[PDB]
Amino acid sequence: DKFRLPYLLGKADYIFVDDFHPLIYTVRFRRSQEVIQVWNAVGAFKTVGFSRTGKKGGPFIDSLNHRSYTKAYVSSETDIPFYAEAFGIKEKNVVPTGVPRTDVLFDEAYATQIKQEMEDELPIIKGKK
Amino acid sequence: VKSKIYIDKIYWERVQLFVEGHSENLDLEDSNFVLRNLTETRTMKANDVKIDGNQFVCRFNVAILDNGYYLPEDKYLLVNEQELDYIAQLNPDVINDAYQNLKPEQEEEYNELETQNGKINFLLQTYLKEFRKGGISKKTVYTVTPEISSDVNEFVLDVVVTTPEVKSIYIVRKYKELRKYFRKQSFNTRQFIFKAIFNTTKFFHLKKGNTVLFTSDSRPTMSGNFEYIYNEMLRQNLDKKYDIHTVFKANITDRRGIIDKFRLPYLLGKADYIFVDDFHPLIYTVRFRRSQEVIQVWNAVGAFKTVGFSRTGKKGGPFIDSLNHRSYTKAYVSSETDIPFYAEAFGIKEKNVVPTGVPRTDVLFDEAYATQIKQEMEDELPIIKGKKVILFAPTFRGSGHGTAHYPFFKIDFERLARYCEKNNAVVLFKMHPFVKNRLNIADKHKQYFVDVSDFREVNDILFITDLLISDYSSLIYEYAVFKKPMIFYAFDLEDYITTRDFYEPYESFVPGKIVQSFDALMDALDNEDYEGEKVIPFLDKHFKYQDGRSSERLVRNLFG
Ligand SMILES: Nc1ccn([C@@H]2O[C@H](COP(=O)(O)OP(=O)(O)OC[C@@H](O)[C@@H](O)[C@@H](O)CO)[C@@H](O)[C@H]2O)c(=O)n1
């Protein structure tokens, strides 16, 4: 994997990133390459990224800690400025399509199945609330 | 009433800077707010602009503005792009609001303010936002402070990016140190050999020769002041008695040819009459014998702005112990009143300063040359056939040639062009040769405005113009001979007076209206009142001789 990471980063057109990935921020990508950041957290609640500038543990304004993104995907349009400025990327890059992990909360069949599974594996949840 | 847009309040979110205000006589529906630098190289639209009637708020992001990066070290104006731009002037409410909320120690520090700009900056330091990594570090700072820039007299957002000195590997550091040492040794050896050859060359004569040397570090070939002195010498058979040598360099920072490198010191030692025209630093590092003469024929005409030792204690000036202008015996000025100022400037005795008239002004009092140059400028520039011709000609706003610059944005092209269209007049522009900016001209602008920064003859255009909008240059001296009015664009009078003042007070010295803002220009030209009644006294007083025989008197005085 040590050899695969730089070579694959160089040759891969589409790259998906889930969280802070420090290695990907030490290189410059071609314009043809699309680096995609799909944040694990659903929405913009707690100050992340460049919004911590001036606070402890926050990157400097000139750092490249989240710049190399082509697309970032967010839950709703009200997160476009917050997350766009958090990654230090353009607002056109950030798009409100919805988090891929939120696709699991609206399926009825999985809801019922997991309800039964949690009832079985936790006997205490037999109660009313 | 002119449409204006003001800044009412400056918020600051986490890293996001907000500007809110209102505008009058201006519909903001199609507004494009930007952050434009004084040098006009960086524009960046506000990320979000919310508009409610004449009220507005502009959401600026110092993290993603510069095409995705942060705002670099510069000074930015808030400009509403449109068919006509608008530089947002700060409301006086904002600077009033800070003024009433000073803690007593702030008040104690507040009294030592020289001018309005210092008051403005100190009051607006309460809108500062400093970003330090972790909030503690004092060595990496990204600070944005709204302020009215003294140099441009306009509201700006100074962004200072303090970064530590990043050093490379010890091999590269050793290489850099060795390179610096080698450069220092080379410079020392060159100075040693220059001093040696000059000293030896003068020591072998100890007598009165017949050689005349013209030198200038900033005038390729013989031209300017030297040309008239040389022509006057040749006219009265002074080339049949003396021998004339010329040593020239393209510019101050340029290097010299192989022959001239060692020919200049040899002639400096040998020459009895040595001629200079401006700062010639290779001459102020040597000592001359008494029988020699170093004639300083300054390019400019009169003592308008400070120069030499007269700016000691000010930035860019020499300390009182320097020899930077002292090796002269006959410095020639155009008026009696220039003797004390110019003797102070050069650091020479006042008897060394003679009021004969600068030879460059030989042509201004001529008549055949007037018709000749009028025909030449009419043919080569047919656009000057308008009813009146106006000439903008400001001086450099920088500290010197190395820092040459000009914030042109102070001039709005469209309003002047509309005035020209209404008045069937033409305005011509000639920035100083010590400039680095290039003019940009638009469609209707080309039909009136003319970019003139290439014409070799400095006084070429003054023969045709019926006005002159200049602020601080000595061009008003040459133009004064034509009995014409001029307007003065004292845009940054306070800052310029602070940096380098004038040998006389500015407000009364200038022969014309004083003017601070562009609206004052349209007031003066639209009303067609210029106070030309005082340009005739200026020409009478600051020009000792009106006979136009300056070169003749200079050569007669020097040689007999
Ligand atoms: N648009 C322009 C304006 C001016 N010019 C020519 O440039 C010369 C000097 O002009 P300027 O004074 O601005 O330059 P400096 O600051 O170096 O002069 C220092 C000081 O000695 C001098 O001002 C004196 O008046 C005070 O003692 C003059 O010949 C002008 O014709 C030009 O070609 N085009």
Helices (H) and strands (E) in chain B, counts: 16, 21
CA–CA dist A73, A102 (Å, integer): 12
How far lies B465's CA from each of B97, B246, B417, B430, in Å? 47, 35, 17, 12
Contact B432 CB / ligand 1 (< 6 Å): yes
How far lies B154's CA from each of B266, B410, B436, B495, in Å? 52, 9, 21, 12
Displacement of CA B43 from its chain's centroid (Å): 25
Q: Which amino acid is at B406?
A: Y
Residue with tokens 């190395």: B402
**Could you write out the three-class secondary structure of B362-375?**
HHHHCCHHHHHHHH
Of B299, B304, B278, residue with least CA distance to B473: B304
> B478 near B383, Cβ under 8 Å?
no
Nearest CA in chain A to B138: A54
CA–CA dist B92, B86 (Å, integer): 17
Mutation for testing the A interface, residue in B47, B133, B144, B166 having most A CBs under 10 Å: B133
Entry resolution in angstroms? Answer: 3.4
β-sheet with B55-61: strand ranges across: B48-52, B55-61, B16-24, B4-12, B89-90
Tokens of A105: 């909360």
Of A73, A122, A78, residue with least CA distance to A102: A73
Whole-number Å distance, alpha carbon B511 to ligand 1 midpoint, is 17
User: B362 burial class (0-12, 13-18, 19+ CB within 10 angstroms)?
Assistant: buried
As beta bridge partners, residue B488 has: B514
CA–CA dist B236, B239 (Å, integer): 8
Chain B CB contacts of A89 below 8 Å: 64, 68
CA–CA dist B298, B296 (Å, integer): 6
* Among B62, B135, B136, beta carbon nearest to A61: B62
Nearest CA in chain B to A93: B68
- Give B502's DSSP letter: B
Q: Which amino acid is at B40?
A: E
> B488 near B468, Cβ under 8 Å?
no
CA–CA dist B231, B422 (Å, integer): 46
Q: How far apart are the first and last CA of chain A?
A: 47
CA–CA dist B281, B286 (Å, integer): 10
Displacement of CA A97 from its chain's centroid (Å): 13
> B432 near B396, Cβ under 8 Å?
yes
Nearest-Cα distance to chain A for B147, in Å, is: 22
Show the beta-strand stretches assigned E in B396-544: 425-429, 450-451, 486-489, 512-515
As beta bridge partners, residue B165 has: none
- CB neighbourhood size of B515 (10 A): 19
Q: Which amino acid is at B288?
A: F
B340 three-class SS: helix
Which phi and psi (to 5°) does residue B11 adopt? -80, 175
Residue with tokens 């990594």: B133
- Give B382's DSSP letter: G
CA–CA dist A73, A84 (Å, integer): 10
Sign of torsion, CA B282 B248 B258 B268? negative
**Could you write out the three-class secondary structure of B216-248?**
ECCCCCCCCHHHHHHHHHHHCCCCCCCEEEEEE
CA–CA dist B157, B128 (Å, integer): 10
> B415 near B493, Cβ under 8 Å?
no
Residue with tokens 């550091």: B173
The method of structure determination was cryo-EM
Chain B CB contacts of A54 below 8 Å: 15, 130-133, 135
Helices (H) and strands (E) in chain A, counts: 3, 4
B66 three-class SS: strand
How far lies B492's CA from each of B111, B113, B151, B396, B514, in Å? 22, 17, 6, 12, 12
A92 three-class SS: coil
Tokens of B549: 């025989």
Q: Which amino acid is at B141?
A: V
Tokens of B455: 């014409």
CA–CA dist B363, B493 (Å, integer): 32
CA–CA dist B145, B75 (Å, integer): 10
Sign of torsion, CA B150 B153 B155 B157? negative
Pinpoint the alpha helices (H) of B286-367.
338-346
Of A40, A104, A95, A51, residue with least CA distance to A72: A95
Residue positions counted in chain B: 560
B189 three-class SS: helix
CA–CA dist B377, B450 (Å, integer): 13
CA–CA dist A15, A81 (Å, integer): 23
CB contact under 8 A, A54 and B163: no
Residue with tokens 């205000």: B21
CB contact under 8 A, B142 and A90: no
CB contact under 8 A, B135 and A54: yes
Of B431, B437, B434, residue with least CA distance to B401: B434
CA–CA dist B550, B168 (Å, integer): 60
CA–CA dist B256, B354 (Å, integer): 32
CB contact under 8 A, B70 and A91: no
Q: Which amino acid is at A65?
A: N
How far lies B458's CA from each of B154, B302, B382, B453, B462, in Å? 31, 16, 19, 10, 8
Pinpoint the alpha helices (H) of B59-169.
92-99, 104-110, 116-124
Tokens of B325: 């202008």
How far lies B419's CA from each of B97, B312, B426, in Å? 38, 43, 9
As beta bridge partners, residue B242 has: none
CB contact under 8 A, B14 and A47: yes
As beta bridge partners, residue B76 has: B37, B157
Of A40, A29, A99, A35, residue with least CA distance to A69: A35
Contact B307 CB / ligand 1 (< 6 Å): yes
- CB neighbourhood size of B543 (10 A): 23
Residue with tokens 């005795």: B349
CA–CA dist A86, A104 (Å, integer): 26
> A72 near A65, Cβ under 8 Å?
no
> B366 near B335, Cβ under 8 Å?
no
CA–CA dist B29, B31 (Å, integer): 6
Q: What share of chain A is helix, strand, coil (3-state, %, to 5)?
A: 40, 10, 50
Nearest CA in chain A to B140: A60
B134 three-class SS: helix
Nearest-Cα distance to chain A for B47, in Å, is: 8
> B45 near B34, Cβ under 8 Å?
yes
CA–CA dist B259, B120 (Å, integer): 56
